[PDB]
């Protein structure tokens, strides 16, 4: 039908920043469905975006964010994607201003691993795994998001030579330029675990360009305070943060791991999520005044 | 629905024809059953340019201009959903019949075409590829401008574009010369198109395009292959369109007031010509 994008979608306040554009809350008028729309400038390189969109379409999982459609308004591309009420793990940490406790981390990580396992089965590498790109259901289920820099592998033994991602979370092999597998994501997950636990990635204080050079050379990162963390969690991170890819555990293996195995159900998350929202609203209500 | 797969949303049928940057396929919207024409564009193609084409279509709201319904991504391809015209392009109509258009048919088509141009120019956009191929007829016989692949926008109504683009036979002299050109450039194409409808091909058509492009700026304005057949009014109209200098060339609005355009019969006359083409088309199937 000849219906404009505004006719189709009623657009609310911007949620946050997507990899290529800001992301906005929106409603689908015909169904009353809530969706997230990312507005991308025409200036941005489209070919890369099309590739990102294709990967999302290929994916069909509860742990991966769905792509619904795209529209053109003015001279911009709007990409319509599944909406997660809770927001990014990073957002939840920021609103509460409290880092996650181990039980929360384990439950979230377990869901993320199931998502990674799906992507990996599908021979795709996310390449940007970080807390910001892990998204939560109001129900508290976790999904992988923002496959802006994601890559595809032809075969089990195929590798990618491209160096891309967010530097703090980037695998050393990726930096080394040897070429790498899906396993690169697993290292990134390890940095993320630290991120949830301590609220920032290692080397966060140093400039990203300086940091990128250091990572291959340096020994694997460790908790700032070892004393605080449990044996299972410490091991799980230790396993993720292995410099040499062959040594590093797969997502399938990790799910077997005790820290993941004993992880509590998504319900335990609910109070934390509720708090994050109420904090969000108050800031919103304060914003109205 | 909102999350439905691209195959789910649209049923795609036979390829209608060829449009710039891709090929156009007949499709049926499953929800409404409405019929649309969808053009499939390669990812490797210059999307930034394509986005520009789509926005121009969105900006237009005319009976005389083809309508943009939306786009979707399947595979790596970008699919553009556009209004479907049953009659097809004038070129299709000429080709299927194998008969060139009579004066009465031509004037009626031009009037709608001129009306479309007048609107386009009002919005300060130059189509830049006006040809029989790009003029589309619905079953009713109303005519619409179709292809916006090379279409250009003027930042200011005063402003001009130096870009050299289009299909070479229909190209205006001002464009071929690197001197700046505006909306009036379309009118020249309109003149070439009128000849094309009468003779079934453009002037120089049997000649090589590179050879022709060089000639056009230097050369005298084109004339009917046999002048005897054509009327005084049609002859004058073509001459007004085909003026080497942009400044002395007529505006679309001026052309609408022109006698050949003014005396045009209603679209109802077109009915016999359209029917024959469609009837022919079914038989070939
Ligand atoms: C689809 N999507 C994304 O791709 C990405 S990737 C990085 C961020 C996003 N964003 C912004 C999103 N935020 C949401 N939902 C959501 C819900 C609440 C909030 S909050 N913390 O401002 O209340 C943010 C995002 N849902 C989905 C996304
Ligand atoms: C939207 N559109 C176009 O943009 C353009 S521009 C140049 C060509 C087109 N095409 C291919 C089209 N053909 C149609 N409809 C249509 C219907 C019948 C036939 S025919 N002559 O094969 O029976 C051709 C096109 N409808 C629309 C188009
Ligand atoms: Cl399970």
Tell me, using a 6 A CB cutoff, whether residue A84 lines ligand 1.
yes
The domain locations on chain A are 1-83, 84-289
The closest CB to that of B55, out of A43, A66, A74, belongs to A74
B125-126 and B152-153 beta bridge pairing:
antiparallel
B79 Cβ contact partners less than 8 Å away, ≥ 6 residues apart:
B6, B38, B39, B40, B41, B71, B72, B73
The closest CB to that of A54, out of B47, B67, B75, belongs to B75
B208 Cβ contact partners less than 8 Å away, ≥ 6 residues apart:
none
Q: Are B276 and B146 in contact (CB under 8 A)?
A: no
Cα–Cα separations (whole angstroms), residue A107 to A136, A202, B125, B185, B261: 12, 22, 57, 66, 75
Residue contact B43–A57, C-beta within 8 A: no
- Is residue A87 a known part of a binding site? no
Residue contact A70–B67, C-beta within 8 A: no
Q: Which of helix, strand or coil describes residue B188?
A: helix
Q: Are A38 and A49 in contact (CB under 8 A)?
A: no
CA distance A68 to chain B (A): 5
- Is residue A188 a known part of a binding site? no
Token readout for A100 is 């996650």
- Is residue A190 a known part of a binding site? no
CA dihedral A90, A92, A93, A95 (to 10 degrees): 120
Tell me, using a 6 A CB cutoff, whether residue A18 lines ligand 1.
yes
Residue A99: Cβ-neighbour burial (10 angstroms; 0-12, 13-18, 19+): middle
CATH top class, domain B85-285: mainly alpha
Fold for domain A1-83? Phosphorylase Kinase; domain 1 (3.30.200)
Question: Degrees (nearest 5) of the Cα angle B242, B248, B249?
Answer: 40
Nearest CA to ligand 2 atom 16: B88
A137 Cβ contact partners less than 8 Å away, ≥ 6 residues apart:
A84, A85, A86, A143, A266
Resolution (in Å) of the shown entry? 2.5
Q: What is the CATH number of domain A84-289?
A: 1.10.510.10
Phi, psi of B204, rounded to the nearest 5 degrees? 80, 5
- In whole angstroms, give the CA distance from residue B224 to residue B203: 8
Q: Which residues of chain B lie closer than 8 angstroms to A51, CB-CB?
A: 76
The closest CB to that of A68, out of B3, B76, B78, belongs to B3
From A41, which residue of chain B is nearest by alpha-carbon distance? B48
PDB experimental method: X-ray
Residue contact A71–B70, C-beta within 8 A: yes
Residue of A36, A45, A75 to mutate when probing chain B, most B C-beta within 10 A: A75
Q: Which residues of chain B lie closer than 8 angstroms to A6, CB-CB?
A: none
Fold for domain B1-84? Phosphorylase Kinase; domain 1 (3.30.200)
End-to-end CA distance of chain A: 40
- Considering Cα of B154, then B160, then B161, then B166, what sign does the dihedral take? positive
Tell me, using a 6 A CB cutoff, whether residue A23 lines ligand 1.
yes
Which candidate, A8, A70, A4, A3, places its Cα nearest to that of A42?
A70
Q: Which residue has the tokens 């609408």?
A: B256
- In whole angstroms, give the CA distance from residue B183 to residue B251: 9
CA distance A186 to chain B (A): 28
């Amino acid at each position: 039908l000849t219906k404009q994008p505004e006719e189709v979608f009623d657009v609310l306040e911007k949620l946050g920043e997507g990899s290529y554009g800001s992301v906005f809350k929106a409603i689908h008028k015909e169904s009353g469905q809530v969706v997230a729309i990312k507005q991308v400038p025409v200036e941005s390189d489209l070919q890369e975006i099309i590739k990102e969109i294709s990967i999302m379409q290929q994916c069909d999982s509860p742990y991966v964010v769905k792509y619904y459609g795209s529209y053109f308004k003015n001279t911009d591309l709007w990409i319509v994607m599944e909406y997660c009420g809770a927001g990014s793990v990073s957002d939840i940490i920021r609103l509460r201003n409290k880092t996650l406790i181990e039980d929360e981390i384990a439950t979230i990580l377990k869901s993320t691993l199931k998502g990674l396992e799906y992507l990996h089965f599908m021979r795709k590498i996310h390449r940007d795994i970080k807390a910001g790109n892990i998204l939560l259901n109001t129900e508290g289920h976790a999904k992988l998001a923002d496959f802006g820099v994601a890559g595809q592998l032809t075969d089990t033994m195929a590798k990618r030579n491209t160096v891309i991602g967010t530097p703090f979370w980037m695998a050393p092999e990726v930096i080394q330029e040897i070429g790498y597998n899906c396993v690169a994501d697993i290292w990134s997950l390890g940095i993320t675990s630290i991120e949830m636990a301590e609220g920032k990635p290692p080397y966060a204080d140093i400039h990203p360009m300086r940091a990128i050079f250091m990572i291959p050379t340096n020994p694997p990162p460790t908790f700032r305070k070892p004393e605080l963390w449990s044996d299972d969690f410490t091991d799980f991170v230790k396993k993720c943060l292995v410099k040499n890819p062959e040594q590093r555990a797969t997502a399938t293996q990790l799910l077997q791991h005790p820290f993941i195995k004993n992880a509590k159900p998504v319900s335990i998350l609910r109070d934390l999520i509720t708090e994050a929202m109420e904090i969000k609203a108050k800031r919103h209500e304060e914003q109205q005044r």
